[PDB]
Design a protein around this nucleic acid. Structure first.
Lengths: 129, 129, 129, 129, 129, 129
RNA sequence: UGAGGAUUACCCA
RNA sequence: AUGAGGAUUACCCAUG
RNA sequence: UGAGGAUUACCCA
RNA sequence: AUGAGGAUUACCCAUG
């Protein structure tokens, strides 16, 4: 393998897709950023570590820019009004096989699948009702 | 509408799919569990809160069990050998438009798409490299 | 989806039926109240909690009022002359599957079925003899 | 005459019905037990008492076992893997006529009727949502 | 019933009406928001509780955006310069019947009716004179 | 002009309408009461204040009485069995245009329009669900 | 009294 | 609030 | 826990 | 100032 490659983070059907490419690997923490200023960039980082004697833990972080009314290349303050932050922690017990691990990935894909409750509440600036 | 509906968490292609259904909304924490004894059920929980004057924060948790039958005191009980835990927090500024929010949802879907770096590392009990 | 909806508490043919509607769901306690004066209303509350490591516990309460008019100093108010109070607690181990739970529900319905010892003693101001 | 008789606690069509038979009526507590091993039996108890000057109070208890075989040292015994415990207390003022009592009984039957919020939450390992 | 539905908050005679739709139901507090960023959204929340032994209390809150010179989807600070807040508390004694309650609703509709003093002072950036 | 005029608080369609008239302006609190003994009168009060350097705040109160005749000391007095209280505060930024203010007034009128969720819940002694 | 626990007519505050 | 802090996972830790 | 009470999500042992 | 704090409703509470 060698999975440290460029990938499409936001699929817009070929036109205006957001691709994210390897940009840093300091300390085993892989980073991928889009082609923008770091203030307006799409950013992804990932790392695995053994949290305790029984678990391994993946920490994945995603930063997404506020695009509506954005001035490309501009200085937009406050930083917090223009960015969203995703932080995921996946704890997997050392007994989990590749097959167990494949199922965990499907559970994550199913959760965020289009039309499902969670992605629909988020996309609509809503909660559950 | 009511976005509090059941969905399939693990799509095993129509056969052996894991579907999760609404099971509790006490304390503003939406919960969904699979049709199992509570000791073996998959579980999804979600809540949103205005974490600050200018952010809203979603807290999402998924528990994937490894089911087993355990003999306790000579008697057999439906149990989970172990559980894998996904904990995610998403902070979105209040200035984010619905289309800004849809962008976050798509980035999360792309991040986990089959074949992309992260879901590949996880499924192979590997790190990024 | 929701099970926090209105339902018929007292079925009197299709007329004189007492319906109880959702009213409040604060702190994990769901409350249903019948219409008109809160003073002469029926009330149902329900809550679930993990009572211990292996148990989940339901607490249900029902109040049946004796509707009456109070006259004091010539001022009459709608009141409940008195009220019966039902309180029930149901403990279910986390090992109970959906089938086990359905059986528990049938046992509760059979206990109170018309003609059986218990609903008969109560409906007649009686005990067991 | 007697209301201390056997009755169907769990109606499973006309086969697999759990019947509970009188067993003991000591100290004002009537007890009903299903047949076969006392260890795997269903149990119902009921008692009435004048709780105060104006009230009479019923205390009803039901136990639904999870039938299982225990094997220890090669010696197997019929046991209940676990048990659900229902406990209910019903307070009725001495002013309640037979009509008032019949209404109280219908309110209890309606609460647990199939399809209503409460029996539905329990039968599905759920709470209110 | 089931009154948790979408409704027209600002009636502009069909063209450019502001509709507000269910968006959250965490803790029994119903929320409805318009289709906008949460910073520019029309928001309505409502909840009932028994404040004391004699009263029930409805708490209704409304947030209305400053629309003149607004930049749709933009980041507009300070938040307080761009939003109006309405907070209503309605205390109703437990003796009030549906009919008493209908009259209270008319009293509220009459107060805010067009051409009446209060709505005319507000709409004119005025007080009473 | 002088917006301090009488209006009909409860429009019972020309017959039995409750009209309220200016009755006091002491201390900057505009008051309106119905033609009744002060013990049975409906009452509306309103005041505006620059609550901060950048806001103005309107405080509005409505009292709806439930009238009755009470025999105190063998003598009959016109009285109110109870009163329902509406307390509302509206904070508007100083930057709000007159058309911004008209938008607030319309949102308040739509909120309470017949058939909409909130006025429906109140009139039926119900919550939102 | 307790949306207090339970090995369920026990036990706790 | 922050942590590539921990968990038995709607809990705990530390810092601030 | 309680065949403990209650103005019933309170209170008592 | 904030409170889905209370009221007997132009008063009271709590926090800050």
């Amino acid at each position: 393998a060698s999975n440290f490659t460029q990938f499409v983070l936001v699929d817009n059907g070929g036109t205006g897709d957001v691709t994210v490419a390897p940009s840093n690997f300091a300390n085993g923490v892989a980073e991928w950023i889009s082609s923008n200023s770091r203030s307006q960039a799409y950013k992804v980082t990932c790392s695995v570590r053994q949290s305790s004697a029984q678990n391994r833990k993946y920490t994945i972080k995603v930063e997404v820019p506020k695009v509506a009314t954005q001035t490309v290349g501009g200085v937009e303050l406050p930083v917090a009004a223009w960015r969203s932050y995703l932080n995921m922690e996946l704890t997997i017990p050392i007994f989990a096989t590749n097959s167990d691990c494949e199922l965990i990935v499907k559970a994550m894909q199913g959760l965020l699948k289009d039309g499902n409750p969670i992605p629909s509440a988020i996309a609509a600036n809503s909660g559950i009702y």
